[PDB]
Write a protein that binds this ligand. Sequence first.
Ligand code: PEE
Ligand code: CLR
Ligand code: CLR
Ligand code: CLR
Ligand code: CLR
Ligand code: CLR
Ligand code: CLR
Ligand code: CLR
Ligand code: CLR
Ligand code: CLR
Ligand code: CLR
Ligand code: CLR
Ligand code: CLR
Ligand code: CLR
Ligand code: CLR
Ligand code: CLR
Ligand code: CLR
Ligand code: CLR
Ligand code: CLR
Lengths: 540, 541
Amino acid sequence: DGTILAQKLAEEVPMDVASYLYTGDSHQLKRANCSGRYELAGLPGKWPALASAHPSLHRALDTLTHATNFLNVMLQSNKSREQNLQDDLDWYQALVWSLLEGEPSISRAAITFSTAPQVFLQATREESRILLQDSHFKWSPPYLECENGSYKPGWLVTLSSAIYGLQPEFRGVMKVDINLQKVDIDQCSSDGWFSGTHKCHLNNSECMPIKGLGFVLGAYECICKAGFYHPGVLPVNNFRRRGPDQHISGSTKDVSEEAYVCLPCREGCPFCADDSPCFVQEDKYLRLAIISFQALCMLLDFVSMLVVYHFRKAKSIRASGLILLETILFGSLLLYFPVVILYFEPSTFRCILLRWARLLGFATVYGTVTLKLHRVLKVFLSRTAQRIPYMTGGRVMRMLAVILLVVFWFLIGWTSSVCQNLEKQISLIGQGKTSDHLIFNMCLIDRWDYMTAVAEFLFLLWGVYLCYAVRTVPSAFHEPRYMAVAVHNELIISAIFHTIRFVLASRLQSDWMLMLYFAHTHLTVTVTIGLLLIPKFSHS
Amino acid sequence: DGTILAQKLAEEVPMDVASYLYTGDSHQLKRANCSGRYELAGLPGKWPALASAHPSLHRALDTLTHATNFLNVMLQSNKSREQNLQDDLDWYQALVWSLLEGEPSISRAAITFSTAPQVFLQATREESRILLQDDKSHFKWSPPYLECENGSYKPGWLVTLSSAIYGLPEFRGVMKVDINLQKVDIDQCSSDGWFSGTHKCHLNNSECMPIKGLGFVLGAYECICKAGFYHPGVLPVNNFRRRGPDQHISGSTKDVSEEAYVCLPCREGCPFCADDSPCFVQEDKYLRLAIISFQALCMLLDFVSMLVVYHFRKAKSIRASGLILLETILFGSLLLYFPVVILYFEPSTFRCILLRWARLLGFATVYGTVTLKLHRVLKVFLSRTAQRIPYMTGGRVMRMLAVILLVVFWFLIGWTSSVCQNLEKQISLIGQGKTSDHLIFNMCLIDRWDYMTAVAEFLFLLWGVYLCYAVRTVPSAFHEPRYMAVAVHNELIISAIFHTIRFVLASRLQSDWMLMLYFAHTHLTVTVTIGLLLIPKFSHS
Ligand SMILES: CCCCCCCC/C=C/CCCCCCCC(=O)OC[C@H](COP(=O)(O)OCCN)OC(=O)CCCCCCC/C=C/CCCCCCCC
Ligand SMILES: CC(C)CCC[C@@H](C)[C@@H]1CC[C@H]2[C@@H]3CC=C4C[C@@H](O)CC[C@]4(C)[C@H]3CC[C@@]21C
Ligand SMILES: CC(C)CCC[C@@H](C)[C@H]1CC[C@H]2[C@@H]3CC=C4C[C@@H](O)CC[C@]4(C)[C@H]3CC[C@]12C
Ligand SMILES: CC(C)CCC[C@@H](C)[C@H]1CC[C@H]2[C@@H]3CC=C4C[C@@H](O)CC[C@]4(C)[C@H]3CC[C@]12C
Ligand SMILES: CC(C)CCC[C@@H](C)[C@H]1CC[C@H]2[C@@H]3CC=C4C[C@@H](O)CC[C@]4(C)[C@H]3CC[C@]12C
Ligand SMILES: CC(C)CCC[C@@H](C)[C@H]1CC[C@H]2[C@@H]3CC=C4C[C@@H](O)CC[C@]4(C)[C@H]3CC[C@]12C
Ligand SMILES: CC(C)CCC[C@@H](C)[C@H]1CC[C@H]2[C@@H]3CC=C4C[C@@H](O)CC[C@]4(C)[C@H]3CC[C@]12C
Ligand SMILES: CC(C)CCC[C@@H](C)[C@H]1CC[C@H]2[C@@H]3CC=C4C[C@@H](O)CC[C@]4(C)[C@H]3CC[C@]12C
Ligand SMILES: CC(C)CCC[C@@H](C)[C@H]1CC[C@H]2[C@@H]3CC=C4C[C@@H](O)CC[C@]4(C)[C@H]3CC[C@]12C
Ligand SMILES: CC(C)CCC[C@@H](C)[C@H]1CC[C@H]2[C@@H]3CC=C4C[C@@H](O)CC[C@]4(C)[C@H]3CC[C@]12C
Ligand SMILES: CC(C)CCC[C@@H](C)[C@H]1CC[C@H]2[C@@H]3CC=C4C[C@@H](O)CC[C@]4(C)[C@H]3CC[C@]12C
Ligand SMILES: CC(C)CCC[C@@H](C)[C@H]1CC[C@H]2[C@@H]3CC=C4C[C@@H](O)CC[C@]4(C)[C@H]3CC[C@]12C
Ligand SMILES: CC(C)CCC[C@@H](C)[C@H]1CC[C@H]2[C@@H]3CC=C4C[C@@H](O)CC[C@]4(C)[C@H]3CC[C@]12C
Ligand SMILES: CC(C)CCC[C@@H](C)[C@H]1CC[C@H]2[C@@H]3CC=C4C[C@@H](O)CC[C@]4(C)[C@H]3CC[C@]12C
Ligand SMILES: CC(C)CCC[C@@H](C)[C@H]1CC[C@H]2[C@@H]3CC=C4C[C@@H](O)CC[C@]4(C)[C@H]3CC[C@]12C
Ligand SMILES: CC(C)CCC[C@@H](C)[C@H]1CC[C@H]2[C@@H]3CC=C4C[C@@H](O)CC[C@]4(C)[C@H]3CC[C@]12C
Ligand SMILES: CC(C)CCC[C@@H](C)[C@H]1CC[C@H]2[C@@H]3CC=C4C[C@@H](O)CC[C@]4(C)[C@H]3CC[C@]12C
Ligand SMILES: CC(C)CCC[C@@H](C)[C@H]1CC[C@H]2[C@H]3CC=C4C[C@@H](O)CC[C@]4(C)[C@H]3CC[C@]12C
Ligand SMILES: CC(C)CCC[C@@H](C)[C@H]1CC[C@H]2[C@H]3CC=C4C[C@@H](O)CC[C@]4(C)[C@H]3CC[C@]12C
């Protein structure tokens, strides 16, 4: 409301808004009336003595105070004839002369002393003569000399006092014309004189709510109407920075007197450009040819669960067993959620579940392959001695529950110990640095990933020794020959992947960490269920 | 040097020091030729430029200067000679009346007007009657003035602001204005502004600030210096020094009030005040040694028992139990006797980590082969019922413990490397807590993995409990699997009770009550375990 009142008053007084914008103005054109009786004056009503426009105003009021006090003293003096003789009238000239020779900026001052006017006046400071014509420190609005045309003066005020006489009041006043030209024109904020507390072009109405900490003022807000002087305060035009966000500085359009959008240069970073900087564009033509192929090989794996169920009466599946063949086949679905979870975005619950699907999908697929490969050695070796008929799931799914109890215990402890530092430090989401000064959101390794990448390497060495003990064991379907490739293959292309994933942990873009999780799970997982399932229906 | 200057001049101007600290000393003050003539206030400056003595000092000067400028007009006025008429004199009287009424603070103000002295003096503010009795410029200054007469009287200090009149060779006169400062505070006595500007603060600052870091000896008033003028709302904060925990704390020990000294006290290890006791828990060394003198005796007996068992290696009782399998239990139990020797020692960062390497490696060694020995007898009994006999002594049971040991080592290596990686962010190991009496003692904290490595023991001992249940009718000649039955349940119960007591009452137990717990727990489960698997071997053949 305060800003718009000045806008209306600009056209409420013609040919004066140019005088506000340019302090010269009258130097170029001068043909008008005695304009400028009062414009905005004191937007908060009026300032008695406040707003501290320099110390000139206060000291002028003070000198007027203890200069009219002088006449207020020679009021109750007895036997005061006051003949107004030649010497007596020269008494009154001295005070008016002294009223000018103690202040930096001051203009004509006059006294009525109506007993017969006996009005005395003087000219401006340091150059004034004498000319005779023929309450409680009231104030006056800005002014401009009415004489003829407009001239330079610059809205001089007419602060005046009153004189009371004894016998009512004297019908006399004391005029002081303060020169207000070379005076700082407020600061367009921080409530003072004629620019009251907002009084500019949209500090916060356009650029502040969206752009936190706008700082549109600096030292002079929206630099406003002005017109008095150009002091050393350095009017800060378009000082709003506010860092980034929707509203930046405003160096796009709407600049000079008419100044408004200041809304641009906002994309992810404290910069000013298009969406070239950080938050690199995620290619959508490559992320839709992977998740759509990761879910076509996932539903082609759930369909294969029904097929073996329908073929459970065959001579090739009865030997392996229906319960030890779908434990492998169901645990390979948990190995297909390195990519569906890494695709969306890094998060806290979305990065804890990454470790719950890799450690439980490994103890189920490769934790029972080495158990039915351990059976083959122990059955032949001990039946060469004769007895101990071994059994199917119930003595091998009972030895697997122990493996799934040590790994299920670690996950509970690790999850509980990782959702505790969140009150102090969150390491589940980090940031990276590229060559071209670009940053992406990833998951940070917490030194519990180099040790669960050795437990997978030490557990697969037990399946390597068993592949040598069954090297000369006759078999009907050569199954121990396909369970030996699937262990020597998982062992090799999983140590290489972890080494690449650990060394190049911060130099891999988020779009390049799903072309490595997609070439891993399709060279170790898809060739494991392609070796344990294909030589069961055909090629018997 | 500045602080000492006040005490040095205290004797240079006697009878006035009591008038400084006690502004009311004037009324008894009776005689003396006069009173104060001068104070050496030149240490900060000749007189304070931009003085902090209100705006009264800077605004009372305006009344005199703008009256001198009024008088600085007719010095050159034509025909302004006259003969000092009665009307001319009344205007000058009006001048001085205006000067007196221009400021409440301004006292008697006088003008000379030497042509005939024509010197005028009036009474004080708000009550003033006129009285008539018979170079350098630019507003010179004067030192504080004490009215002479007899004694010192109430008004006290009066600054005599003076100027000069240059009439057309000067005028041989001065403008006299006296300002009263009995309502003016003496700066702060520690900023830079009146008699004690950043000085005259005896027995403070360097006394308690370098050793007592962040001394804050001021607060809001350091060393209330002169007084004598007034006691405004500044509220002189004498002895306001706190300094937090420094070698010199506050200073409320001795040498209080005026004569100040001895500000050094209440400092040992803690931000408290009194003696060393409040932040030092009791440490009964006669009890803390009565535990090690007993707990270290059991270690020597355990080690001697190893040689004793080795000597009787051909005994019928030990041949049927396994010499290689019996030494491992003793060695593991020896390794379970280091949660107390490490605890007794004050909690370091190397020692508070080794406390978990000895408990975990000593549990999987003692209660990791009792269960295997109990399992092998069940396997032998089941197999021998119908046709082959398939287990043997150390070598088939001894190398089945290697898997458990490997898992334990893997977990220990994983945890050790993950706890000495957070030290860059948080030690999270050496914490502290109170005993409900604001007496704190350092100890170790819980890493939240200790909660998990206490159900693992509980879940592992359930296998041994089931094995104990399975074997209850097998013929045993030496009752070997009957003594191991009690040794599993006893530990399973007391270890769980001790663990839950330690976890619940974790931050409310003193250091000496933690030793009494770690020592009582290790003698009801560990000493009894080797009291059942060892004693019925040499005796009761
Ligand atoms: C809190 C402290 C308490 C200590 C408790 C720790 C318990 C940890 C281990 C739990 C029990 C694990 C199995 C132990 C039971 C008995 C061992 C055993 O006999 O297995 C030997 C078994 C064959 O036995 P046989 O009698 O010949 O065959 C009979 C078949 N009918 O052979 C093996 O299992 C060899 C084991 C090597 C496997 C590879 C392990 C390599 C290291 C991995 C460490 C990882 C630990 C877990 C971390 C998981 C991280 C996700
Ligand atoms: C999901 C988690 C919490 C529960 C796991 C507990 C149960 C389901 C575990 C996991 C797999 C289970 C086995 C799966 C299949 C069989 C074959 C059946 O002929 C007898 C029971 C038996 C041998 C189960 C015994 C219990 C078992 C070992
Ligand atoms: C992932 C971890 C925690 C648990 C693993 C779950 C496993 C053990 C469960 C999940 C689904 C289960 C299968 C569900 C249905 C059938 C058909 C039935 O005629 C034989 C058992 C069989 C084939 C189950 C075997 C065990 C099984 C594969
Ligand atoms: C793949 C299947 C078998 C996984 C089994 C479900 C697991 C992953 C679920 C069960 C309970 C879950 C947790 C429950 C609560 C929290 C606290 C929250 O502030 C962060 C996530 C976190 C820590 C969850 C992580 C995922 C979680 C551990
Ligand atoms: C995945 C985790 C949480 C489950 C762990 C629990 C497993 C190991 C438990 C639950 C129920 C248990 C079975 C319950 C009953 C019997 C019959 C008896 O002959 C003892 C062994 C046997 C066959 C147990 C073997 C272990 C067992 C399968
Ligand atoms: C297969 C599923 C059902 C079993 C998994 C159960 C485990 C993962 C659950 C059971 C209770 C859970 C805890 C319950 C409460 C809290 C407090 C919270 O501030 C942080 C997570 C934490 C510490 C949870 C961590 C995960 C947790 C330990
Ligand atoms: C061989 C199989 C068991 C895989 C085991 C994983 C090993 C090789 C991994 C786990 C943690 C890895 C290290 C993690 C971080 C760094 C710092 C980097 O500036 C150089 C490589 C180096 C030093 C890695 C080397 C490879 C490493 C030691
Ligand atoms: C890191 C150091 C201390 C451990 C080195 C040996 C560790 C890694 C263990 C883990 C599993 C172990 C293998 C697991 C299984 C067997 C079965 C047995 O038929 C002979 C030993 C053999 C073939 C092991 C030899 C070494 C081995 C790989
Ligand atoms: C391209 C590679 C790196 C991806 C992984 C596939 C590897 C592990 C698989 C795919 C096909 C497999 C081969 C298929 C058939 C045979 C014939 C058999 O008598 C010996 C093993 C051998 C020779 C296999 C070795 C392993 C093998 C080469
Ligand atoms: C798609 C990417 C991940 C590669 C996957 C290739 C897999 C599915 C293919 C490539 C070569 C294939 C093998 C080639 C030869 C034979 C012999 C024949 O008796 C059928 C099974 C077997 C053993 C095949 C199993 C499946 C196999 C391993
Ligand atoms: C791995 C750590 C924590 C514990 C393992 C220590 C065990 C396995 C070692 C330590 C000292 C060893 C004993 C030292 C000396 C002898 C005497 C010899 O005539 C028979 C073997 C026997 C009795 C050893 C058996 C194994 C033993 C008990
Ligand atoms: C020395 C310490 C620090 C390392 C860990 C100790 C382990 C690895 C050692 C200590 C005693 C060793 C056993 C001592 C003797 C035998 C008998 C026979 O069956 C060969 C292996 C076997 C069973 C050893 C296996 C490894 C073993 C268990
Ligand atoms: C064999 C089983 C029990 C565990 C083996 C652990 C030993 C051999 C090795 C394997 C991987 C290794 C870690 C790999 C990477 C790092 C990060 C480096 O900045 C400090 C050392 C540290 C933390 C290594 C410590 C030693 C370590 C844990
Ligand atoms: C039984 C043997 C194999 C285990 C020996 C333990 C060794 C390998 C482990 C235990 C504690 C470990 C240290 C723990 C903490 C740190 C600080 C880290 O900033 C650098 C690595 C460093 C210095 C680790 C180095 C490896 C370390 C010394
Ligand atoms: C309060 C706490 C400490 C009680 C201690 C438990 C004691 C009293 C209990 C727990 C398990 C018990 C044993 C369990 C099984 C057997 C086998 C049986 O054929 C004779 C008794 C015997 C040997 C029991 C003796 C008493 C026993 C040792
Ligand atoms: C019997 C076995 C489980 C012994 C180990 C006890 C573990 C598993 C559990 C059982 C009950 C648990 C306590 C139950 C309640 C509380 C109060 C809470 O404000 C802090 C944790 C604390 C103190 C728990 C700490 C862990 C605790 C002691
Ligand atoms: C010192 C405190 C903790 C008390 C514990 C002392 C232990 C060592 C004592 C208390 C009771 C004792 C048992 C009491 C009776 C017998 C029966 C005897 O035929 C063989 C020894 C045996 C089995 C003792 C072994 C040692 C024993 C367990
Ligand atoms: C990772 C790169 C090198 C490709 C992976 C190829 C590896 C894993 C494959 C290719 C050929 C494979 C076979 C080579 C030799 C034999 C002997 C044969 O009687 C059974 C299969 C077995 C034991 C395979 C082991 C794994 C093997 C070496
Ligand atoms: C940390 C310690 C245990 C490391 C010692 C390394 C070597 C000596 C140990 C560690 C693990 C051990 C075992 C690995 C695998 C098996 C198969 C198991 O059915 C009987 C013991 C046996 C045959 C052990 C052989 C020796 C072994 C490889």
